[PDB]
Enzyme design. Structure first.
Site, mmCIF file in Angstrom:
data_model
loop_
_atom_site.group_PDB
_atom_site.id
_atom_site.type_symbol
_atom_site.label_atom_id
_atom_site.label_comp_id
_atom_site.label_asym_id
_atom_site.label_seq_id
_atom_site.Cartn_x
_atom_site.Cartn_y
_atom_site.Cartn_z
ATOM 1 N N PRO A 101 7.315 -6.228 -5.838
ATOM 2 C CA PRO A 101 7.960 -5.187 -6.654
ATOM 3 C C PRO A 101 8.423 -3.984 -5.826
ATOM 4 O O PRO A 101 7.797 -3.657 -4.813
ATOM 5 C CB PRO A 101 6.859 -4.786 -7.636
ATOM 6 C CG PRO A 101 6.021 -6.019 -7.770
ATOM 7 C CD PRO A 101 6.031 -6.667 -6.416
ATOM 8 N N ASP A 102 9.516 -3.347 -6.245
ATOM 9 C CA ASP A 102 10.032 -2.186 -5.524
ATOM 10 C C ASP A 102 9.219 -0.943 -5.866
ATOM 11 O O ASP A 102 9.403 -0.310 -6.908
ATOM 12 C CB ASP A 102 11.513 -1.959 -5.844
ATOM 13 C CG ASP A 102 11.794 -1.952 -7.335
ATOM 14 O OD1 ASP A 102 10.920 -2.407 -8.103
ATOM 15 O OD2 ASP A 102 12.888 -1.505 -7.737
ATOM 16 N N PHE A 103 8.313 -0.604 -4.961
ATOM 17 C CA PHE A 103 7.482 0.579 -5.096
ATOM 18 C C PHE A 103 8.148 1.735 -4.371
ATOM 19 O O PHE A 103 7.521 2.749 -4.054
ATOM 20 C CB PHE A 103 6.078 0.307 -4.550
ATOM 21 C CG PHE A 103 6.063 -0.347 -3.188
ATOM 22 C CD1 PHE A 103 6.075 0.413 -2.027
ATOM 23 C CD2 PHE A 103 6.025 -1.730 -3.073
ATOM 24 C CE1 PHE A 103 6.061 -0.197 -0.783
ATOM 25 C CE2 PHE A 103 6.011 -2.341 -1.833
ATOM 26 C CZ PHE A 103 6.029 -1.573 -0.688
ATOM 27 N N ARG A 104 9.440 1.566 -4.124
ATOM 28 C CA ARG A 104 10.223 2.554 -3.407
ATOM 29 C C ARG A 104 11.353 3.032 -4.305
ATOM 30 O O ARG A 104 11.975 4.066 -4.049
ATOM 31 C CB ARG A 104 10.769 1.973 -2.099
ATOM 32 C CG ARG A 104 9.694 1.479 -1.134
ATOM 33 C CD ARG A 104 8.694 2.581 -0.776
ATOM 34 N NE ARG A 104 7.736 2.125 0.229
ATOM 35 C CZ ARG A 104 7.825 2.382 1.532
ATOM 36 N NH1 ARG A 104 8.826 3.117 2.005
ATOM 37 N NH2 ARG A 104 6.906 1.910 2.365
ATOM 38 N N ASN A 122 6.635 -2.647 7.037
ATOM 39 C CA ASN A 122 6.056 -3.195 5.828
ATOM 40 C C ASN A 122 4.555 -3.149 5.880
ATOM 41 O O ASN A 122 3.957 -3.265 6.945
ATOM 42 C CB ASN A 122 6.525 -4.627 5.602
ATOM 43 C CG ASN A 122 8.012 -4.723 5.375
ATOM 44 O OD1 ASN A 122 8.692 -3.717 5.147
ATOM 45 N ND2 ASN A 122 8.531 -5.935 5.455
ATOM 46 N N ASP A 125 2.759 -5.170 3.697
ATOM 47 C CA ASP A 125 2.437 -6.337 2.884
ATOM 48 C C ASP A 125 1.629 -7.355 3.669
ATOM 49 O O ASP A 125 1.121 -8.324 3.107
ATOM 50 C CB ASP A 125 3.718 -6.972 2.339
ATOM 51 C CG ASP A 125 4.754 -7.265 3.425
ATOM 52 O OD1 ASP A 125 4.383 -7.728 4.524
ATOM 53 O OD2 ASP A 125 5.957 -7.031 3.174
ATOM 54 N N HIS A 179 3.600 1.411 9.981
ATOM 55 C CA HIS A 179 3.101 2.276 8.925
ATOM 56 C C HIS A 179 1.750 1.806 8.396
ATOM 57 O O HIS A 179 1.344 2.183 7.300
ATOM 58 C CB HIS A 179 4.118 2.383 7.799
ATOM 59 C CG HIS A 179 5.366 3.098 8.202
ATOM 60 N ND1 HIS A 179 6.567 2.930 7.549
ATOM 61 C CD2 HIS A 179 5.609 3.951 9.224
ATOM 62 C CE1 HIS A 179 7.492 3.668 8.137
ATOM 63 N NE2 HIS A 179 6.937 4.298 9.156
ATOM 64 N N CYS A 213 -12.883 5.555 4.755
ATOM 65 C CA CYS A 213 -13.218 6.767 4.018
ATOM 66 C C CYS A 213 -12.428 7.969 4.553
ATOM 67 O O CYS A 213 -12.136 8.056 5.747
ATOM 68 C CB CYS A 213 -14.721 7.042 4.103
ATOM 69 S SG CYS A 213 -15.261 8.599 3.354
ATOM 70 N N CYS A 271 -15.778 10.327 6.547
ATOM 71 C CA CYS A 271 -16.610 9.826 7.630
ATOM 72 C C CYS A 271 -15.947 8.717 8.448
ATOM 73 O O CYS A 271 -16.518 8.254 9.434
ATOM 74 C CB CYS A 271 -17.933 9.331 7.060
ATOM 75 S SG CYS A 271 -17.728 7.971 5.922
ATOM 76 N N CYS A 304 -16.809 5.673 -0.939
ATOM 77 C CA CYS A 304 -17.518 5.464 0.313
ATOM 78 C C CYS A 304 -19.012 5.211 0.100
ATOM 79 O O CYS A 304 -19.636 5.848 -0.749
ATOM 80 C CB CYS A 304 -17.324 6.681 1.211
ATOM 81 S SG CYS A 304 -18.225 6.618 2.744
ATOM 82 N N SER A 339 16.078 -3.167 7.186
ATOM 83 C CA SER A 339 15.660 -1.773 7.137
ATOM 84 C C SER A 339 16.844 -0.864 7.378
ATOM 85 O O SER A 339 17.613 -1.056 8.317
ATOM 86 C CB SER A 339 14.570 -1.484 8.166
ATOM 87 O OG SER A 339 14.068 -0.171 8.000
ATOM 88 N N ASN A 358 21.217 -6.207 7.654
ATOM 89 C CA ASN A 358 20.776 -5.426 6.508
ATOM 90 C C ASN A 358 21.692 -5.637 5.306
ATOM 91 O O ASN A 358 22.758 -6.238 5.433
ATOM 92 C CB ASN A 358 20.720 -3.943 6.875
ATOM 93 C CG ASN A 358 19.789 -3.158 5.980
ATOM 94 O OD1 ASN A 358 18.927 -3.730 5.303
ATOM 95 N ND2 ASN A 358 19.956 -1.839 5.964
ATOM 96 N N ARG A 359 21.289 -5.127 4.145
ATOM 97 C CA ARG A 359 22.115 -5.245 2.948
ATOM 98 C C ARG A 359 23.266 -4.254 3.019
ATOM 99 O O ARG A 359 24.314 -4.464 2.411
ATOM 100 C CB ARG A 359 21.291 -4.998 1.681
ATOM 101 C CG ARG A 359 20.989 -3.533 1.436
ATOM 102 C CD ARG A 359 20.143 -3.304 0.193
ATOM 103 N NE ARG A 359 19.996 -1.882 -0.128
ATOM 104 C CZ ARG A 359 19.274 -1.006 0.574
ATOM 105 N NH1 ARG A 359 18.621 -1.389 1.668
ATOM 106 N NH2 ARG A 359 19.209 0.264 0.189
ATOM 107 N N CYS A 419 19.058 -10.702 3.578
ATOM 108 C CA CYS A 419 18.504 -11.036 4.882
ATOM 109 C C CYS A 419 18.288 -12.532 5.065
ATOM 110 O O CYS A 419 18.713 -13.099 6.072
ATOM 111 C CB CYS A 419 17.203 -10.282 5.104
ATOM 112 S SG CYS A 419 17.471 -8.548 5.487
#
Ligand SMILES: Oc1ccc(/C=C/c2cc(O)cc(O)c2)cc1
Ligand SMILES: Oc1ccc(/C=C/c2cc(O)cc(O)c2)cc1
Ligand SMILES: Oc1ccc(/C=C/c2cc(O)cc(O)c2)cc1
Ligand SMILES: [Zn+2]
Lengths: 370, 4
Positions: A111-114, A186, A188, A203, A211, A214, A235, A281, A305-306, A322
């Site tokens: 799903p597009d979480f962007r 990504n 994922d 990323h 945590c 700590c 934690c 990207s 890319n698109r 892609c």
């Protein structure tokens, strides 16, 4: 008033007579002396984005000095233009860097979480404090309220998605030992599932959690339980009275440093790569977006890319979905590459054909230059 | 200085 007139050119490391030259530090110095709002200069350098309000002015200035210090963009190499040229490169090259983004996981069902209509719709409805999808990955907001992130976490968790043609392609180039490194943005963790060995997850990923206080690390399977029940995973060591004792997955949130393994890998691969390939990207987030400008300019660069990248000059641009483009390249490559798919029940109802727009551009299915 |  100030010393600067606005026409100066800021160097780091009709106009018939030379314009004045200032250093970025000198420039910002001047603007401090006037007391100008950094958000302004930030909006002049990056018009399309607003800095989060939790940014102190001095930080913003540091960001401006950063932007002003960034390397020169690469001039397109006119030797290389065609998809033919591109395949010739993919064959002759021996130390290939592959830079990937969400475009290699499109066919995987994540799903597009962007985007603003994806998970963000329902999440925003439930948490109206969230400004935009990116806030879902803002470290400060997470500190403030990690609920939206974990209401969302189970949706993209590493257990239920399959690699794409792209992943398989990269993994195969790694088997054949041509892959110098696959930098992915990504989270994922599909690069691993597809069996790519030389990956750098710029990323971070869901692979571990840690945590906030700590730094106690655990596997993704340690937290999976709480996440799928939508409970903020706490934690073990930290005293219960302490609220920020949360097991935060080790993905690089906005405002966080990237892993040192990344910077190390870049400093090494910087002078070894003989072919750069950006796949899926659009390179909007820094410092990863800086990578194409950071390697030696004579190294040929290929885009898959698109959409084209306005802020970047690639030698060959393949614009489309892609997996389609990758499939095409496989067919041109022969060998194990042509042999490469287990889900071509969906590539058999998608056009094989493209349209060449000289000297650089190729338009495939799933492209959008809208 | 290189934060995401
Ligand atoms: O509003 C904004 C907030 C943050 C940024 C980040 C800029 C940046 C620039 C670099 O050269 C390196 C880097 O790691 C980050 C840009 C705009
Ligand atoms: O090119 C782009 C690069 C980054 C972004 C994200 C910005 C952002 C938005 C937030 O609500 C919180 C945050 O910490 C960051 C948007 C576009
Ligand atoms: O040199 C620098 C490079 C980047 C940054 C990042 C600032 C920042 C802080 C946030 O809470 C959210 C965000 O999206 C960005 C700061 C200094
Ligand atoms: Zn703790």
């Amino acid at each position: 008033d100030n010393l600067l007139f606005g026409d100066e050119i800021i160097t780091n490391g009709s106009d018939w007579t030379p314009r004045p030259r200032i250093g970025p530090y000198t420039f910002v110095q001047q603007h401090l002396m006037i007391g100008t709002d950094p958000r302004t200069i930030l909006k002049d350098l990056l018009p399309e984005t607003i800095p989060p309000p939790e940014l102190d002015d001095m930080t913003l200035w540091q960001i401006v000095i950063n932007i002003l210090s960034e390397p020169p963009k690469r001039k397109k190499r006119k030797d290389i233009n065609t998809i033919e040229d591109a395949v010739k490169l993919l064959q002759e090259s021996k130390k290939i860097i592959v830079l990937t983004g969400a475009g290699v996981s499109v066919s995987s069902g994540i799903p597009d979480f962007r985007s603003r209509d994806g998970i963000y719709a329902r999440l925003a409805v439930d948490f109206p404090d969230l400004p935009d999808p990116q806030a879902m990955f803002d470290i400060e907001y997470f500190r403030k309220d990690p609920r939206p992130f974990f209401k969302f976490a189970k949706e993209i968790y590493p257990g239920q998605f399959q690699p794409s043609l792209c992943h398989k392609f990269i993994a195969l180039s790694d088997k054949e030992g041509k892959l110098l490194r696959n930098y992915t943005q990504n989270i994922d963790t599909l690069e691993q599932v597809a069996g790519i060995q030389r990956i750098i997850q710029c990323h971070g990923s869901f692979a571990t959690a840690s945590c906030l206080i700590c730094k106690y690390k655990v596997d993704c399977e340690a937290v999976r339980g709480d996440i799928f029940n939508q409970v903020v995973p706490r934690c073990p060591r930290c005293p219960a009275d302490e609220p920020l004792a949360i097991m935060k997955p080790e993905i690089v949130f906005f405002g966080e440093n990237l892993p040192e393994q990344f910077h190390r890998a870049m400093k090494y691969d910087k002078d070894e790569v003989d072919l750069l390939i950006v796949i899926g990207s659009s390179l909007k987030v820094r410092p990863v977006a800086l990578i194409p400008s950071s390697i030696p300019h004579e190294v040929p660069q290929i885009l898959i890319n698109r959409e084209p990248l306005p802020h970047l000059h690639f030698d060959v641009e393949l614009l489309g979905d892609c997996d389609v483009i990758i499939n095409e390249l496989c067919h041109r490559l022969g060998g194990e590459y042509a042999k490469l798919s287990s889900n071509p029940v969906k590539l058999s109802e998608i056009t094989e054909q493209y349209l060449f727009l000289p000297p650089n551009r190729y338009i495939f299915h799933g492209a959008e230059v809208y | 200085r290189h934060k995401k």
